[PDB]
Amino acid sequence: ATPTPTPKAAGSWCVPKPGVSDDQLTGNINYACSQGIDCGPIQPGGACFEPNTVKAHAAYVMNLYYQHAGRNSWNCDFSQTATLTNTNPSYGACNFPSGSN
């Protein structure tokens, strides 16, 4: 009938800790990329892309992928790096993916 906007999600965020050994996080994209919705939609937009991290791609898909299985915390199968983090880590302009696009 009529297109209605959506609020902001909150609770937890599944993403690789920004600091771990690049090579370590890199293992994510490699694995996740073997899922389907991982490789491809990992294209940056420009908002926070730069600087762009290695496992950045994995962090992107982590949004949909996480909600692809069952939007559960166990949806994180990337690695011991990409997992549910504390409250919204987004300090501001840079918003972390919580699942919603």
PDB file of C-alpha atoms in Angstrom:
ATOM      1  CA  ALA A   1       0.000   0.000   0.000  1.00  0.00           C
ATOM      2  CA  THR A   2       2.652   2.501   1.084  1.00  0.00           C
ATOM      3  CA  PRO A   3       6.451   2.261   1.473  1.00  0.00           C
ATOM      4  CA  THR A   4       7.460   2.746   5.108  1.00  0.00           C
ATOM      5  CA  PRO A   5      10.987   3.449   6.412  1.00  0.00           C
ATOM      6  CA  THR A   6      12.900   1.216   8.825  1.00  0.00           C
ATOM      7  CA  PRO A   7      14.438   2.073  12.222  1.00  0.00           C
ATOM      8  CA  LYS A   8      17.966   1.286  13.412  1.00  0.00           C
ATOM      9  CA  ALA A   9      18.966  -2.175  14.629  1.00  0.00           C
ATOM     10  CA  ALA A  10      20.916  -2.741  17.844  1.00  0.00           C
ATOM     11  CA  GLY A  11      22.189  -5.512  20.098  1.00  0.00           C
ATOM     12  CA  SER A  12      25.228  -7.204  18.578  1.00  0.00           C
ATOM     13  CA  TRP A  13      27.542  -6.966  15.569  1.00  0.00           C
ATOM     14  CA  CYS A  14      29.368  -9.861  13.910  1.00  0.00           C
ATOM     15  CA  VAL A  15      32.631  -8.521  12.484  1.00  0.00           C
ATOM     16  CA  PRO A  16      36.388  -9.243  12.556  1.00  0.00           C
ATOM     17  CA  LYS A  17      38.274  -7.303  15.229  1.00  0.00           C
ATOM     18  CA  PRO A  18      39.986  -4.388  13.434  1.00  0.00           C
ATOM     19  CA  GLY A  19      43.545  -5.048  14.561  1.00  0.00           C
ATOM     20  CA  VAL A  20      44.206  -8.781  14.345  1.00  0.00           C
ATOM     21  CA  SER A  21      46.871 -10.161  12.010  1.00  0.00           C
ATOM     22  CA  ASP A  22      45.724  -9.181   8.518  1.00  0.00           C
ATOM     23  CA  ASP A  23      46.685 -12.613   7.193  1.00  0.00           C
ATOM     24  CA  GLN A  24      44.619 -14.069  10.036  1.00  0.00           C
ATOM     25  CA  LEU A  25      41.473 -12.167   9.055  1.00  0.00           C
ATOM     26  CA  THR A  26      42.205 -12.772   5.372  1.00  0.00           C
ATOM     27  CA  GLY A  27      41.308 -16.405   5.978  1.00  0.00           C
ATOM     28  CA  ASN A  28      37.702 -15.284   6.366  1.00  0.00           C
ATOM     29  CA  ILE A  29      37.025 -13.940   2.874  1.00  0.00           C
ATOM     30  CA  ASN A  30      38.771 -17.033   1.511  1.00  0.00           C
ATOM     31  CA  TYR A  31      36.428 -19.337   3.428  1.00  0.00           C
ATOM     32  CA  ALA A  32      33.244 -17.261   3.336  1.00  0.00           C
ATOM     33  CA  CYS A  33      33.859 -16.575  -0.353  1.00  0.00           C
ATOM     34  CA  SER A  34      33.174 -20.301  -0.700  1.00  0.00           C
ATOM     35  CA  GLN A  35      29.589 -19.797   0.462  1.00  0.00           C
ATOM     36  CA  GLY A  36      28.084 -17.861  -2.431  1.00  0.00           C
ATOM     37  CA  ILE A  37      26.775 -14.526  -1.181  1.00  0.00           C
ATOM     38  CA  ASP A  38      30.270 -13.775   0.118  1.00  0.00           C
ATOM     39  CA  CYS A  39      32.280 -13.150  -3.051  1.00  0.00           C
ATOM     40  CA  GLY A  40      30.804 -10.388  -5.190  1.00  0.00           C
ATOM     41  CA  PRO A  41      28.615  -8.258  -2.896  1.00  0.00           C
ATOM     42  CA  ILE A  42      31.813  -7.396  -1.026  1.00  0.00           C
ATOM     43  CA  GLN A  43      32.105  -4.293  -3.206  1.00  0.00           C
ATOM     44  CA  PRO A  44      32.914  -1.111  -1.240  1.00  0.00           C
ATOM     45  CA  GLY A  45      30.795   2.030  -1.413  1.00  0.00           C
ATOM     46  CA  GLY A  46      33.143   4.772  -0.278  1.00  0.00           C
ATOM     47  CA  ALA A  47      31.674   5.644   3.111  1.00  0.00           C
ATOM     48  CA  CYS A  48      34.343   3.920   5.199  1.00  0.00           C
ATOM     49  CA  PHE A  49      35.870   1.796   2.436  1.00  0.00           C
ATOM     50  CA  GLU A  50      39.043   3.876   2.697  1.00  0.00           C
ATOM     51  CA  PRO A  51      41.018   2.934   4.459  1.00  0.00           C
ATOM     52  CA  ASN A  52      40.044  -0.569   3.339  1.00  0.00           C
ATOM     53  CA  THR A  53      41.020  -3.582   5.445  1.00  0.00           C
ATOM     54  CA  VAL A  54      41.991  -7.019   4.136  1.00  0.00           C
ATOM     55  CA  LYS A  55      39.076  -8.947   5.635  1.00  0.00           C
ATOM     56  CA  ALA A  56      36.928  -5.909   4.846  1.00  0.00           C
ATOM     57  CA  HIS A  57      34.988  -7.895   2.245  1.00  0.00           C
ATOM     58  CA  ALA A  58      34.052 -10.507   4.848  1.00  0.00           C
ATOM     59  CA  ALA A  59      32.831  -7.711   7.118  1.00  0.00           C
ATOM     60  CA  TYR A  60      30.432  -6.584   4.390  1.00  0.00           C
ATOM     61  CA  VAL A  61      28.772  -9.911   3.592  1.00  0.00           C
ATOM     62  CA  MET A  62      28.725 -10.598   7.333  1.00  0.00           C
ATOM     63  CA  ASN A  63      25.639  -8.375   7.246  1.00  0.00           C
ATOM     64  CA  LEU A  64      23.515 -10.503   4.915  1.00  0.00           C
ATOM     65  CA  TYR A  65      25.288 -13.811   5.534  1.00  0.00           C
ATOM     66  CA  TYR A  66      24.578 -13.493   9.256  1.00  0.00           C
ATOM     67  CA  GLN A  67      20.894 -13.139   8.384  1.00  0.00           C
ATOM     68  CA  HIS A  68      21.195 -15.685   5.573  1.00  0.00           C
ATOM     69  CA  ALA A  69      21.325 -18.697   7.892  1.00  0.00           C
ATOM     70  CA  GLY A  70      19.041 -17.565  10.699  1.00  0.00           C
ATOM     71  CA  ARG A  71      20.169 -14.110  11.796  1.00  0.00           C
ATOM     72  CA  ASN A  72      21.683 -15.841  14.826  1.00  0.00           C
ATOM     73  CA  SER A  73      25.015 -15.337  16.592  1.00  0.00           C
ATOM     74  CA  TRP A  74      26.043 -18.796  15.394  1.00  0.00           C
ATOM     75  CA  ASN A  75      25.790 -17.490  11.831  1.00  0.00           C
ATOM     76  CA  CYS A  76      29.431 -16.425  12.114  1.00  0.00           C
ATOM     77  CA  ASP A  77      31.459 -19.232  10.541  1.00  0.00           C
ATOM     78  CA  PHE A  78      34.193 -17.043   9.055  1.00  0.00           C
ATOM     79  CA  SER A  79      36.828 -17.443  11.768  1.00  0.00           C
ATOM     80  CA  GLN A  80      37.755 -16.766  15.394  1.00  0.00           C
ATOM     81  CA  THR A  81      38.162 -13.170  14.226  1.00  0.00           C
ATOM     82  CA  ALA A  82      34.733 -12.362  12.796  1.00  0.00           C
ATOM     83  CA  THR A  83      32.289 -12.724  15.689  1.00  0.00           C
ATOM     84  CA  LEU A  84      29.671 -10.879  17.739  1.00  0.00           C
ATOM     85  CA  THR A  85      31.129  -7.753  19.342  1.00  0.00           C
ATOM     86  CA  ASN A  86      29.971  -5.578  22.240  1.00  0.00           C
ATOM     87  CA  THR A  87      27.414  -2.800  21.789  1.00  0.00           C
ATOM     88  CA  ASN A  88      27.407  -0.724  18.602  1.00  0.00           C
ATOM     89  CA  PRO A  89      31.138  -0.018  18.114  1.00  0.00           C
ATOM     90  CA  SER A  90      30.227   2.664  15.574  1.00  0.00           C
ATOM     91  CA  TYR A  91      31.877   5.795  16.966  1.00  0.00           C
ATOM     92  CA  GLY A  92      29.930   7.885  14.472  1.00  0.00           C
ATOM     93  CA  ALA A  93      29.991   8.302  10.700  1.00  0.00           C
ATOM     94  CA  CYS A  94      31.473   4.802  10.563  1.00  0.00           C
ATOM     95  CA  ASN A  95      28.542   2.464  11.211  1.00  0.00           C
ATOM     96  CA  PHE A  96      29.186  -1.242  11.783  1.00  0.00           C
ATOM     97  CA  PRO A  97      27.057  -3.886  10.018  1.00  0.00           C
ATOM     98  CA  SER A  98      24.499  -5.406  12.388  1.00  0.00           C
ATOM     99  CA  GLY A  99      22.607  -7.317   9.715  1.00  0.00           C
ATOM    100  CA  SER A 100      20.266  -4.672   8.323  1.00  0.00           C
ATOM    101  CA  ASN A 101      21.195  -3.020   5.025  1.00  0.00           C
TER     102      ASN A 101
END
